[PDB]
């Protein structure tokens, strides 16, 4: 599958490798579905222009001074000005992986905790971001519940089309973060 590596090892990779950064923005969600299913946390994901689900983020250009500068830049173009109210940093860094695609790409995954108001703010403004209707087809929340039938909810949500290891990254982040 997707091979992980220490951050430093990834930083040692040659110029032939491209870097992508993606952030897992999650907030405490006290609400409930139908008054009996806890929402637990609100987690945002993007439907990307290629019809796949993934976390907000993108490629790191040589202009960006660092992995984080690039991430926060991409997060602004994808989520709108409401993404400037916070900044993902090295402390939010989670893991690095070499993508299994044909090209040489190392993926750096971040997880940043926001407040329900902050997460709802980026939802309302994403429609006027530079990427809305182009690179980003829309934002969706991740259902962390499983419906009575046993398939509805997260299990079926995991049956959609995802970018790279977004499914495994999502589940690994949910267990690590302990949001389940």
């Amino acid at each position: 599958g997707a091979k992980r590596l220490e951050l430093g090892e990834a930083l040692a990779l040659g110029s032939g490798w491209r870097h992508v950064c993606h952030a897992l923005l999650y907030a405490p969600d006290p609400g409930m579905l139908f008054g009996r299913i806890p929402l637990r946390y609100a987690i945002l994901m993007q439907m990307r222009f290629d019809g796949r689900l993934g976390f907000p983020g993108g490629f790191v250009d040589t202009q960006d001074r660092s992995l984080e500068d690039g991430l926060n830049r991409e997060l602004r173009e994808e989520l709108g000005e409401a993404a400037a109210a916070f900044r993902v940093e090295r402390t939010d860094y989670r893991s690095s992986h070499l993508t299994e695609g044909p090209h040489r790409v190392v993926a750096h995954f971040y997880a940043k905790r926001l407040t329900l108001e902050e997460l709802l703010a980026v939802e309302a403004g994403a429609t006027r971001a530079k990427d809305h209707g182009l690179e980003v087809l829309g934002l969706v929340r991740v259902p962390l519940y499983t419906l009575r039938d046993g398939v509805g909810g997260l299990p079926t949500f995991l049956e959609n089309s995802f970018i790279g290891s977004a499914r495994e990254q999502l589940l690994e982040a949910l267990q690590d973060l302990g949001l389940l």
Partner: protein, 118 residues
Amino acid sequence: SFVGLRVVAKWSSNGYFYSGKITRDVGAGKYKLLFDDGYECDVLGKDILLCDPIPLDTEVTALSEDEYFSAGVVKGHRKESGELYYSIEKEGQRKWYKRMAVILSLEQGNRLREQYGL
């Protein structure tokens, strides 16, 4: 020994094969590879193709700049200034690619395990 020899190997169980060299025989049937892209890790002999250059008429995956890639067939080799260049034919048209821009998919590389695999 295999040290120094050029190979094409995948650092993932079901990934693509990338060009590189064997840097050391670390035992247990594992070989430390320095891929031409600078990545270095221990790879099993089963994931290493002792195959350099990639022979003519081999179906390969050619990488373009940007994010595009396509399947093609090797129709030429050119060595200018130490570096190796492949001539890839696609839809009756041939184009040149550097060594690092020529990789093998799991299938394309599996076809060569018998004749070149370790």
